[PDB]
Amino acid sequence: LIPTVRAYDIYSRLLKDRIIMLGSQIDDNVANSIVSQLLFLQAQDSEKDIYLAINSPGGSVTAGFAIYDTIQHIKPDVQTICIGMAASMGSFLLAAGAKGKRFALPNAEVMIHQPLGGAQGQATEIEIAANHILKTREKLNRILSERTGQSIEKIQKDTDRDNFLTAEEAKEYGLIDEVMVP
Least Å distance, CB 8 to a second copy, is 6
> What is the 8-class DSSP label of residue 5?
-
132 is catalytic: no
- Decide if 47 contacts 77 (C-beta within 8 A): no
Q: Does residue 99 touch a second copy according to CB under 8 A?
A: no
- Decide if 49 contacts 17 (C-beta within 8 A): no
Beta pairing class for 109-112 and 163-166: antiparallel
- Decide if 69 contacts 122 (C-beta within 8 A): no
Q: Which of 50, 89, 95, 108 binds a second copy (CB under 8 A)?
A: 108
Q: Does residue 47 touch a second copy according to CB under 8 A?
A: no
Q: Does residue 53 touch a second copy according to CB under 8 A?
A: yes
Q: Does residue 122 touch a second copy according to CB under 8 A?
A: yes
Least Å distance, CB 150 to a second copy, is 18
CA distance 130 to 181: 43
**Crossing angle for the helix pair 61-73 and 123-148, nearest 10 degrees?**
40
Q: Does residue 152 touch a second copy according to CB under 8 A?
A: no
How many residues touch a second copy under the rule CB under 8 A: the total is 88
Mark the segment that binds a second copy (CB under 8 A) among 120-128, 146-154, 170-178: 120-128
